[PDB]
Amino acid sequence: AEYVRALFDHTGHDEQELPFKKGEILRIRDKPEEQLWNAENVEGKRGLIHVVLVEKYG
Amino acid sequence: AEYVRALFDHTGHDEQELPFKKGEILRIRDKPEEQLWNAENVEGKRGLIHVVLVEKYG
Ligand SMILES: [Cu+2]
Ligand SMILES: [Cu+2]
Ligand SMILES: [Cu+2]
Ligand SMILES: [Cu+2]
């Protein structure tokens, strides 16, 4: 809901954002392992996390 | 739902994934401009897109 707890260790890294043009059509990838959230950790660092690697905490 | 249409041009680039440890607690950032989807374009390129920059097409 508001908070999650990590089920595994995870090593930081980058992911790329698609470039696209106005009016371009895109298909959404809906497999669970491809879903991400924006998160913030105890030290204020912000970044993406994979939903499948965490669980609802609060 | 399944497909989106881009409302603006968007230049490709990277975003970082948080590193975290098993059991660590994280807060989810829920502002609209921080939400992303996984998408695929006409040429098979895969990448992240910002929800606020597109609209439901199909
Ligand atoms: Cu990833
Ligand atoms: Cu961007
Ligand atoms: Cu971005
Ligand atoms: Cu990762």
Author numbering:
A (entry chain A), B (entry chain A): 1 to 58
From the study:
In this study, we incorporated a Cu2+-binding site into a natural protein domain, the 58 amino acid c-Crk-SH3, to create a miniaturized superoxide dismutase model, termed SO1. The miniprotein was found to be a strand-swapped dimer with an unusual coupled binuclear Type 2-like copper center in each protomer. SO1-Cu was found to be SOD-active with an activity only 1 order of magnitude lower than that of natural SOD enzymes and 1 to 2 orders of magnitude higher than that of other low-complexity SOD protein models of similar size. SOD proteins disproportionate superoxide into molecular oxygen and hydrogen peroxide and are part of the enzymatic machinery that protects the cell from oxidative stress.
